[PDB]
Design an enzyme around this catalytic site. Structure first.
Site, short mmCIF file in Angstrom:
data_model
loop_
_atom_site.label_atom_id
_atom_site.label_comp_id
_atom_site.label_asym_id
_atom_site.label_seq_id
_atom_site.Cartn_x
_atom_site.Cartn_y
_atom_site.Cartn_z
N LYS A 1 3.09 -2.39 8.76
CA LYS A 1 4.35 -1.72 8.39
C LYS A 1 5.57 -2.59 8.76
O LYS A 1 5.74 -2.98 9.92
CB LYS A 1 4.48 -0.34 9.07
CG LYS A 1 5.60 0.56 8.49
CD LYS A 1 5.84 1.83 9.31
CE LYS A 1 4.70 2.88 9.21
NZ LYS A 1 4.89 4.14 10.04
N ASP B 1 4.96 15.86 12.83
CA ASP B 1 4.89 15.62 11.39
C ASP B 1 3.45 15.60 10.89
O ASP B 1 3.06 14.75 10.10
CB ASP B 1 5.64 14.35 11.00
CG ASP B 1 6.14 14.37 9.55
OD1 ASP B 1 6.07 15.43 8.88
OD2 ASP B 1 6.61 13.32 9.06
N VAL C 1 4.84 -0.95 3.70
CA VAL C 1 3.51 -1.20 4.23
C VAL C 1 2.74 -2.18 3.37
O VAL C 1 2.70 -2.05 2.14
CB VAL C 1 2.68 0.11 4.36
CG1 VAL C 1 1.29 -0.18 4.90
CG2 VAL C 1 3.39 1.10 5.28
N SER D 1 4.83 3.04 -0.93
CA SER D 1 5.61 3.06 -2.18
C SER D 1 7.10 3.06 -1.87
O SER D 1 7.91 3.63 -2.61
CB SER D 1 5.22 4.26 -3.07
OG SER D 1 5.50 5.49 -2.43
N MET E 1 0.79 -1.23 0.00
CA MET E 1 0.00 0.00 0.00
C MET E 1 0.82 1.29 0.00
O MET E 1 0.33 2.32 -0.46
CB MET E 1 -0.94 0.01 1.20
CG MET E 1 -1.96 -1.11 1.20
SD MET E 1 -3.14 -0.86 2.55
CE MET E 1 -2.10 -1.06 4.00
N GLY F 1 11.47 0.85 5.44
CA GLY F 1 10.04 0.99 5.68
C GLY F 1 9.24 0.52 4.47
O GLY F 1 9.50 0.95 3.35
C1 LIG Z 1 -1.01 8.34 2.75
C2 LIG Z 1 -1.23 6.97 3.43
C3 LIG Z 1 -1.73 5.91 2.49
O1 LIG Z 1 -1.48 5.97 1.30
N1 LIG Z 1 -2.48 4.90 3.01
C4 LIG Z 1 -3.03 3.88 2.10
C5 LIG Z 1 -3.84 2.99 3.04
C6 LIG Z 1 -3.10 3.12 4.33
N2 LIG Z 1 -3.87 2.70 5.50
C7 LIG Z 1 -3.32 2.53 6.72
N3 LIG Z 1 -4.15 2.17 7.71
C8 LIG Z 1 -3.60 2.14 8.93
C9 LIG Z 1 -2.27 2.41 9.19
C10 LIG Z 1 -1.51 2.72 8.05
O2 LIG Z 1 -0.17 2.91 8.20
C11 LIG Z 1 0.51 2.64 9.38
C12 LIG Z 1 0.62 3.65 10.32
C13 LIG Z 1 1.27 3.42 11.53
C14 LIG Z 1 1.22 4.56 12.50
O3 LIG Z 1 0.36 5.43 12.38
N4 LIG Z 1 2.21 4.63 13.42
C15 LIG Z 1 2.32 5.55 14.51
C16 LIG Z 1 3.52 5.61 15.18
C17 LIG Z 1 3.72 6.58 16.15
C18 LIG Z 1 2.73 7.50 16.47
C19 LIG Z 1 3.00 8.54 17.53
N5 LIG Z 1 4.32 9.16 17.40
C20 LIG Z 1 4.58 10.03 18.54
C21 LIG Z 1 5.98 10.59 18.46
N6 LIG Z 1 6.18 11.35 17.21
C22 LIG Z 1 7.60 11.81 17.11
C23 LIG Z 1 8.21 12.32 18.41
C24 LIG Z 1 5.83 10.52 16.05
C25 LIG Z 1 4.43 9.96 16.18
C26 LIG Z 1 1.50 7.43 15.81
C27 LIG Z 1 0.33 8.33 16.14
F1 LIG Z 1 0.53 9.58 15.77
F2 LIG Z 1 0.05 8.35 17.44
F3 LIG Z 1 -0.79 7.96 15.53
C28 LIG Z 1 1.31 6.45 14.84
C29 LIG Z 1 1.85 2.17 11.76
C30 LIG Z 1 1.75 1.17 10.81
C31 LIG Z 1 1.06 1.37 9.61
C32 LIG Z 1 0.81 0.23 8.66
N7 LIG Z 1 -2.01 2.80 6.83
C33 LIG Z 1 -2.84 4.62 4.39
#
Ligand SMILES: *CCC(=O)N1CC[C@H](Nc2nccc(Oc3cc(C(=O)Nc4ccc(CN5CCN(CC)CC5)c(C(F)(F)F)c4)ccc3C)n2)C1
Length: 284
Positions: free
Chosen positions: A44, A138, A29, A26, A24, A27
């Site tokens: 991921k 971000d 996923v 283009s 999904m 790390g």
């Molecule tokens: C543009 C995106 C896109 O094309 N698509 C296509 C379909 C895809 N769908 C999808 N569905 C669910 C998840 C996902 O991708 C993932 C996302 C994560 C994820 O969100 N990981 C995290 C990690 C960390 C945080 C919080 N951090 C706090 C600290 N700061 C820096 C100091 C960074 C962020 C979060 C948060 F913000 F809390 F949500 C999320 C993991 C795995 C996958 C697969 N794609 C989307």
């Protein structure tokens, strides 16, 4: 080997219990099927580094998301698998992100949708700060997820040009206390709303990174244009987000009192039907 927590139940699971349904990103996923329940999930794959302080940094981030299950506006994590080389991070599948919606739309996302988006993302950011002491860092359209059920969630997914950094993050005014705080994310949100409301990058005609960073620093913030019918409260919201002096930029609790947010908290908007109407639309 790995545990998946889905719908209150914790399943032991191996990496081979996941059937790969394709990429999904283009790390990297993948869309996968958990063989035990049939759930289609998002996974991921990240490479682990030789620096164990960097592995600790990334697991701390994921720990936050793992404990963010009580926030409706943060994408749900079901668990992880760690090998020697890799971390696999399993999430609820969201159909798309606001970046990909913009490219499909070839133009603006309507205000009623962005209003709901704004409520969700501000509340997600506020939750991260208040409950976990954490800043996102971000905020941008590729980290705003949408699904068929009308949910909008914050995630961290990993000519005209994109730039989402606040002025004080580009160039800290105090070198003694150089750390930007949550107001940097407020600015990124403002920039994201302008981009999505217009369908165009707010900073336009840029040759180099140095030119773009320079523009953010010295130009007036790019606000919503006044010819597109945007509500006064939406224009005020974005303008408050895009305050250059970070000492004057509202924090989340102040943003949550804004009229725009109050209006969209209680307004019924059928995001689901719009999302579907968008995906099923046959006029080019
Ligand atoms: C543009 C995106 C896109 O094309 N698509 C296509 C379909 C895809 N769908 C999808 N569905 C669910 C998840 C996902 O991708 C993932 C996302 C994560 C994820 O969100 N990981 C995290 C990690 C960390 C945080 C919080 N951090 C706090 C600290 N700061 C820096 C100091 C960074 C962020 C979060 C948060 F913000 F809390 F949500 C999320 C993991 C795995 C996958 C697969 N794609 C989307």
């Amino acid at each position: 080997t790995g545990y998946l927590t889905i719908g209150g139940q914790r399943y032991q699971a191996e990496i081979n219990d996941l059937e790969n349904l394709g990429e999904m990103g283009s790390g990297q996923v993948w869309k996968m099927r958990f063989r035990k329940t049939g759930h289609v999930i998002a996974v991921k794959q990240m490479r682990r580094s030789g620096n164990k302080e960097e592995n600790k940094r990334i697991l701390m981030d994921l720990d936050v998301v793992l404990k963010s299950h009580d926030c409706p506006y943060i994408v749900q994590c079901f668990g992880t698998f760690i090998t020697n080389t890799d971390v696999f991070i399993a999430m609820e599948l969201m159909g798309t992100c606001a970046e990909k919606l913009k490219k499909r739309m070839q133009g603006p996302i309507p205000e009623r949708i962005l209003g709901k988006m704004t409520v969700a993302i501000v509340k997600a950011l506020y939750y991260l700060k208040e409950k976990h002491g954490v800043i996102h860092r971000d905020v941008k359209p590729s980290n705003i997820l949408l699904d068929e059920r009308g949910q909008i969630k914050l995630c961290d997914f990993g000519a005209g040009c994109a730039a989402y950094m606040a002025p004080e993050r580009i160039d800290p005014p105090d070198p003694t206390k150089p750390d930007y705080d949550i107001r940097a994310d407020v600015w990124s949100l403002g920039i994201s709303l302008v981009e999505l409301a217009t369908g165009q990058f707010p900073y336009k005609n840029c040759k180099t990174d140095f030119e773009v960073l320079t523009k953010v620093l010295q130009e007036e913030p790019p606000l919503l244009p006044g010819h597109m019918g945007f509500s006064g409260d939406f224009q005020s919201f974005v303008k408050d987000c895009l305050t250059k002096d970070h000492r004057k930029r509202p924090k989340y609790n102040k943003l949550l009192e804004h009229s725009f947010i109050k209006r969209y908290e209680t307004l019924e908007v059928d995001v689901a039907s719009w999302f579907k109407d968008v995906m099923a639309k046959t006029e080019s």
